[PDB]
Design a protein around this ligand. Structure first.
Ligand SMILES: COC(=O)C[C@@H]1N=C(c2ccc(-c3ccc(C(=O)NCc4ccc(S(=O)(=O)Nc5ccc(C)c6c(C#N)c[nH]c56)cc4)cc3)cc2)c2c(sc(C)c2C)-n2c(C)nnc21
Ligand SMILES: [Zn+2]
Lengths: 217, 156, 788
């Protein structure tokens, strides 16, 4: 109907790009996220991606079914967490923005290297700049205080270094590039504990990178 | 569409959360109750850092702490408790202060008395680089507050 | 740094008085204690003849009289806000008078939280113990025996923490104490026996019982009536065992009651002070039975008239009553036997000069002869006035305004003061009494429960007649005022800052900056600029208008189109209240972040935050002594000098403003202003005059290193000779003291102490100077005293 179209093309598009959108763009992978009691406290997990899929394939029958889905997404975050948590602030900001917008609701190696250059250029876009920014440049061992990072990681890597290497044609074949990117992510995994939010961002960006690189010619 | 200053404050807060040397002011301090620092918008972390209300112990090891609650002489309200003295006597006591401190004390006493307690290396270099790269290589706390001061002056 | 602080006009507010046979068993004495002063009087049919005034090193907050057995005359108990306590005796020997200290000591506990309702002191009628209440949940007792000359105390736990008031009771086999305590269930009276043997409480004579929610005073009736009366906001009750009596006269329901005293030693008649000035009398009507016993049967309250707002009352003789004041004039009144032409039974006899509470002051020279004159707003509510002070001892004119003054500024081009003020009206609003705001030659209004309304007054310098009064918008509060010439415009304007108020808002979200001009004997608007906040102060800055709106410090420029335009801003403060200027620099004082220092850069157009002071203080007024020395005062009754550090190794050490001096003034400072009170055309340099809430007007100057070293040694030598009354060590009196930290005084010479050297006898002077001569030092003292 008209309201479903409005939600799909205005509200959904607006909330899909907001700088606080990325954490809610996928199901809550409790096992990876180390959430023991989460799956006992909420009986109806929900996420923006589920909403987009339902809207795109007309899973709904009534428009309010998607509104209650958004409200449930806010409600689960509110219930599980406590005031003062960053996710709580993100949920509050999203809720107020939705309320602002809802009021308007109407009544062949060369081919592989080319592909890898395209992928790396994609990873630099503003489309993912919300949560891919930690890796844009080499991790400074002095400007962030990580004394041991020099020792625990033996091969620092970052997207700028990979871009420079590609511009210099240092990669004889795409397999080296893939190994370098996977090393870049694995270093972050190995250094930090799983709780640190950086990992969440690394998992997101690596999911995107794999989705793109699996299509290498 | 989050504003640039809000986005920068958000990054500052998130990164600072994991620093074991960061010692933010107690969330129950009176400032958070008298509405002198807005708790909703993330920008207040910069305003704190501007005033040295929140500081890094590695750079500033001996900062005098900010009192949790004002002495009752300047607000007339004891911690999270309705005053014993009747309103009229309070009003007669506030008439002795000057014209400005009188208004400030009246405001504080009208606000705090309805408060409710809320149940509860060094990263400075990179923060200062992010701030300056937003407004425009070894730094310390001083060059962080000095940069946040200019950012606030030219942004708010 | 170095400085020199001296007292010019001794304080004149009254915060405690008592009557009894102090100086002799034959005489009757009225004892008035004012801050760090103790005044003694003798009552006579003519009036009061002062016999002795003695200053003490400590803010006297608890004063009482008692006559222990074996003494031919009373003794005086003094407890200061610094917890120095002593017991005094008035000893006379021919024409010489001395105050001899019987016992002295300190009763400050190591830990605790002082109570909200303030220190309380009370004495047993039989003189077996001295009661005190210095902390929540603890009662501090002091056994009264000749042996306890060092005042060794012992505590006793209190069941309930929130004690409103406590008193002793007359006529009990052992000391008994009654008080009012609050808890979630309400407010209750209660009783105990204070056993001096077990050092513990025991259940008292009668039971706890509920009282009116605002019950806030306790009176202990003497024999035979017994019991105590609980004075409330809307009713009065009398409790004694099974006896119980109450009265709720509508007459007192209009206003609260603040003080009381006993008239007849038999307890039949009491006086109750009122916040509106009324002076009620409370009658106890007795009843007797066949058993020969006496009991109470009814209570009556009647209105006698009007007097100054009272902080304490007392009865002397033949209906002569003394009314002390913290907000007005201290009056002696006669209580006649019949109503005097208006229903008032009250007539004044003599009036005393009281200056505080000063809320502003500016130094001018109306004679235009180079002679100083201070004009000071004073008083509150129906006792507001302006006290014009000029050097002779001082001559103190008066001008009643019958409304609250807030600010003043001198405007020479038309020779008239501009004064803000505020009266009180009761919700449509109605006036309570005539006042300058409606008694002026001409009036106009702005048109662009008790509720305040604020007026701006123009007062002529020659006659102090209220030339004109301007009323500000509804609910709007005027906060700051200044007179200056802006930019190139040859006119002279009044500028007033205002802040709107509403019940829901916690931080004011609207305000105005208004520009007025005075010519042709009339007052009219010229320019107004709306701003998003209150305006705590404004200053003339090299032709530009410098203001602070909430936390921001702002700078305005005066166009040729008669409007204010923004130049540059600032945002690094919690709440900026005070401002001062000298050349380019700006000294912003914040609510809690002490003093911030700026420097305006002409060739760039912005403020450079060159320094700060990080120690947390609660500032009240701030001023500049020179390019690099800053003075500031805080409600803790201290002064501290902030100095931009000269030697620094790092960038960080150039941000700290060091607190190079600390001094415990003993007064709440309220405003600073440059000026002096002697003719000019010497050790000290510069001058600054500051008001106080207790009326004490003081002077601050700078000293050169050599003079500071000399006067420091002179000060140390005096304390080994001057027999301070109460044996309170000088350094403890003048030590910086707050809730957080304590520090010995440094950098400030105690003016009042040095001048006292002029009084000691010649042998004492010789002993003082030993290891030079007195005259070579008497000259030094003389040069110093000439500054006031
Ligand atoms: C402390 O220095 C270190 O560690 C080493 C170093 N540090 C950084 C670094 C550190 C932290 C951050 C950062 C960035 C963003 C955020 C953030 O936005 N935080 C909100 C949040 C909270 C929870 C989740 S969630 O996904 O976990 N939770 C969750 C998800 C979904 C749902 C629905 C729910 C739900 C419900 N209903 C309840 N919870 C949920 C998701 C998001 C937090 C931290 C950024 C960078 C760093 C670099 S390079 C560099 C320049 C820097 C600054 N660097 C690399 C690379 N490697 N190491 C490091
Ligand atoms: Zn640091």
């Amino acid at each position: 109907t008209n309201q479903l179209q409005y939600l799909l093309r205005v509200v959904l598009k607006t909330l899909w790009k907001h700088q606080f959108a990325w954490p809610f763009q996928q199901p809550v992978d409790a096992v990876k996220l180390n959430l023991p009691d989460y799956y006992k406290i909420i009986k109806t997990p929900m996420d923006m991606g589920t909403i987009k899929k339902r809207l795109e394939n007309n899973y709904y029958w009534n428009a309010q079914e998607c509104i209650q889905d958004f409200n449930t997404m806010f409600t689960n975050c509110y219930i599980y967490n406590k005031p003062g948590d960053d996710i709580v602030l993100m949920a509050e900001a999203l809720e107020k923005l939705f309320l602002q917008k809802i009021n308007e609701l109407p009544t062949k190696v060369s081919e592989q290297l080319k592909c890898c250059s395209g992928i790396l250029k994609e990873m630099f876009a503003k489309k993912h700049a919300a949560y891919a920014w930690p890796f844009y440049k080499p991790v400074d061992v002095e400007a962030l205080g990580l004394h041991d990072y020099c020792d625990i990681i033996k091969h620092p890597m970052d997207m700028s270094t990979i871009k420079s290497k590609l511009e210099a044609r240092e990669y004889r074949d795409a397999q080296e590039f893939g190994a370098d990117v996977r090393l870049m992510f694995s270093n972050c995994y190995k250094y930090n504990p799983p709780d640190h939010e950086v990992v969440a961002m690394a998992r997101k960006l690596q999911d995107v990178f794999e989705m793109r690189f699996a299509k290498m010619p | 569409n989050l504003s640039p200053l809000e986005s920068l404050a958000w990054q500052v807060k998130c990164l600072l959360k994991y620093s074991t040397t960061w010692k933010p002011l107690n969330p129950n301090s009176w400032l958070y109750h008298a509405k002198l620092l807005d708790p909703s918008t993330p920008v207040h972390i910069l305003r704190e850092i501007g005033l040295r209300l929140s500081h890094c112990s590695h750079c500033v090891p001996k900062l005098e702490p900010i009192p949790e609650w004002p002495p009752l002489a300047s607000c007339g309200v004891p911690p999270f408790q309705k005053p014993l003295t009747s309103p009229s006597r309070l009003s007669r006591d506030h008439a002795t202060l000057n014209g400005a401190l009188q208004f400030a004390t009246k405001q504080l006493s009208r606000t705090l008395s309805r408060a409710t307690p809320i149940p509860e290396g060094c990263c400075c270099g990179w923060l200062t680089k992010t701030v300056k790269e937003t407004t425009r290589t070894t730094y310390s706390y001083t060059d962080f507050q000095k940069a946040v001061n200019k950012l606030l002056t030219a942004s708010l | 740094s170095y400085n020199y602080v001296v007292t010019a006009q001794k304080p004149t507010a009254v915060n405690g008085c008592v009557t009894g046979h102090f100086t002799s068993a034959e005489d009757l004495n009225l004892l008035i204690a004012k801050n760090t002063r103790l005044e003694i009087y003798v009552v006579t049919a003519e009036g009061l003849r002062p016999v002795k005034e003695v200053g003490m090193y400590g803010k006297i907050a608890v004063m009482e009289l008692f006559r222990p057995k074996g003494e031919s005359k009373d003794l005086l108990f003094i407890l200061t806000a610094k917890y120095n306590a002593c017991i005094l005796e008035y000893k006379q020997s021919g024409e010489s008078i001395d105050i001899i200290t019987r016992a002295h000591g300190n009763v400050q506990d190591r830990i605790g939280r002082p109570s909200e309702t303030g220190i309380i002191g009370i004495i047993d009628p039989e003189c077996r113990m001295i009661g005190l209440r210095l902390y929540d949940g603890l009662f501090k007792v002091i056994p009264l025996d000749r042996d306890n000359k060092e005042l060794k105390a012992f505590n006793i736990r209190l069941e309930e923490l929130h004690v409103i008031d406590v008193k002793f009771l007359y006529g009990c086999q052992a000391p008994t104490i009654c008080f009012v305590y609050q808890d979630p269930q309400g407010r209750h009276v209660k009783t105990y026996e204070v056993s001096l043997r077990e050092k513990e409480f025991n259940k008292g004579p009668w039971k706890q019982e509920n009282v009116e929610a605002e019950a806030s005073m306790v009176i202990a009736v003497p024999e035979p009536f017994g019991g105590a009366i609980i004075i409330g906001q809307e009713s009065i009750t009398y409790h004694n065992g099974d006896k119980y009596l109450a009265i709720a006269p509508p007459i007192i329901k209009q206003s609260t009651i603040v003080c009381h005293n006993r008239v007849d030693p038999n307890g039949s008649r009491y006086l109750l002070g009122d916040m509106e000035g009324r002076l009620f009398m409370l009658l106890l009507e007795k009843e007797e039975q066949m058993d020969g016993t006496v009991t109470l049967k009814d209570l009556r309250v009647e209105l006698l008239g009007e007097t100054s707002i009272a902080e304490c009352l007392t009865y002397l003789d033949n209906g002569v009553v003394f009314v002390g004041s913290r907000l007005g004039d201290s009056q002696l009144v006669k209580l006649n036997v019949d109503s005097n032409e208006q229903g008032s039974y009250v007539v004044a006899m003599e009036t005393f000069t009281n200056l505080g509470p000063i809320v502003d002051m500016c130094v001018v020279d109306l004679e235009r002869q180079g002679q100083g004159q201070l004009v000071t707003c004073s008083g509150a509510f129906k006792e507001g006035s302006l006290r014009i002070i000029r050097n002779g001892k001082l001559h103190i004119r008066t001008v009643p305004l019958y409304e609250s003054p807030r600010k003043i500024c001198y405007q020479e081009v038309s020779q008239c003061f501009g004064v803000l003020s505020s009266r009180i009206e009761v919700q449509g609003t109605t006036a309570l009494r005539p006042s300058a705001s409606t008694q002026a030659l001409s009036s106009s209004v702005s048109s662009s429960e008790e509720v305040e309304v604020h007026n701006l007054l123009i007062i002529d310098q020659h006659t102090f007649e209220v030339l004109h009064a301007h009323q500000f918008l509804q609910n709007e509060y005027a906060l700051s005022l200044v007179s200056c010439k802006l930019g190139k415009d040859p006119n002279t304007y009044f500028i007033v800052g205002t802040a709107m108020v509403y019940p829901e808002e916690a931080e004011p979200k609207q305000g105005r900056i208004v520009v007025f001009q005075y010519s042709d004997g009339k007052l009219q608007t010229v320019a107004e600029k709306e701003v998003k906040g209150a305006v705590y102060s404004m200053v003339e800055f090299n032709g530009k208008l410098l203001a602070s709106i909430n936390s921001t410090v702002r700078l305005y420029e005066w166009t040729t189109e008669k409007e204010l335009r923004t130049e540059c801003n600032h945002y690094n403060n919690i709440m900026a209240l005070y401002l001062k200027t000298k050349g380019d620099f700006i000294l912003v004082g914040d609510l809690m972040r002490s003093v911030l220092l700026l420097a305006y850069k002409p060739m760039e157009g912005n403020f450079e935050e060159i320094a700060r002071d990080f120690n947390p203080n609660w500032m009240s007024a701030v001023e500049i002594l020179d390019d690099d020395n800053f003075l500031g005062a805080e409600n803790a009754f201290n002064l501290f000098v902030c100095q931009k550090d000269s030697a620094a190794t790092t960038d960080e050490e150039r941000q700290h403003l060091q607190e190079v001096g600390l001094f415990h003034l003993g007064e709440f400072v309220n405003v600073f202003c440059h000026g002096s009170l002697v003719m000019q055309n010497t050790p000290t340099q510069g001058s600054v005059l500051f008001g106080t809430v207790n009326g004490m007007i003081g002077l601050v100057t700078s000293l050169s290193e050599s003079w500071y070293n000399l006067l420091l040694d002179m000060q140390n030598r005096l304390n080994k000779v001057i027999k301070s009354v109460g044996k309170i060590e000088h350094s403890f009196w003048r030590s910086f003291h707050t809730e957080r930290k304590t520090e010995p005084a440094t950098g400030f010479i105690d003016g009042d102490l040095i001048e006292s050297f002029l009084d000691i006898s010649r042998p004492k002077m010789q002993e003082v100077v030993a290891n030079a001569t007195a005259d070579d030092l008497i000259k030094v003292v003389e040069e110093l005293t000439r500054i006031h």
